[PDB]
């Protein structure tokens, strides 16, 4: 019942998302499901990062998940997959307080050639074990009236980021962040659905 699946940290480039780090729960999946399930919350992560607008807040609903992503202006982007009915305002309380305490601690020279194995943050994977219970949300109420303030835009498919002649199935063929597995994974439950 209402989980996180996983929360990451980008720099936006033009038109390129570096991934920073990455943390993930895919514990309630199959085994043989974890890793392409894995690649493909990164995947998905990395595609809403690049079709977002610096300054953006962003909801985008697929199945029974919901991707809640926040691109700040200074190009860092942070992602939260999450499910449908876990609380939205919590999940942007968990993107402001890591992209936060990551910018304090990387710094932005790092970002743009950054990736897992350079940067040194150790923190978000305890971020998404302690968001998985809403409950224990580091309040800050200055943020949250900011937050109230704030509106986002919500996206009803992966399509809406998309252009009009492109479809999700050529970007998943030519993705270099999908191992052959899950490009087949993607293939077979196109296939079956
Ligand atoms: C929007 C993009 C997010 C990535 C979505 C990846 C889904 C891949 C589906 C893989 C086939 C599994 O089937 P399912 O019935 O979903 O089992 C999952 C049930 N739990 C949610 C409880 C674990």
Redesign the pocket.
Known sequence: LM?L??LSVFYKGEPKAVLLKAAYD?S???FF?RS??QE??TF?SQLIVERSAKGSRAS????????HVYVRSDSLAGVV?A?SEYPSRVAFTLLEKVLDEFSKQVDRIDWPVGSPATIHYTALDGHLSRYQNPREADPMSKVQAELDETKIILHNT?ESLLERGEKLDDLVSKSEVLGTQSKA??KT?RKQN
Do not use: P, R
């Open positions: 989980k699946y996983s895919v309630s999946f199959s499901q392409s399930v493909f919350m998905t985008v609903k697929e199945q029974e998940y919901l991707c997959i499910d992966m994974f993607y439950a």
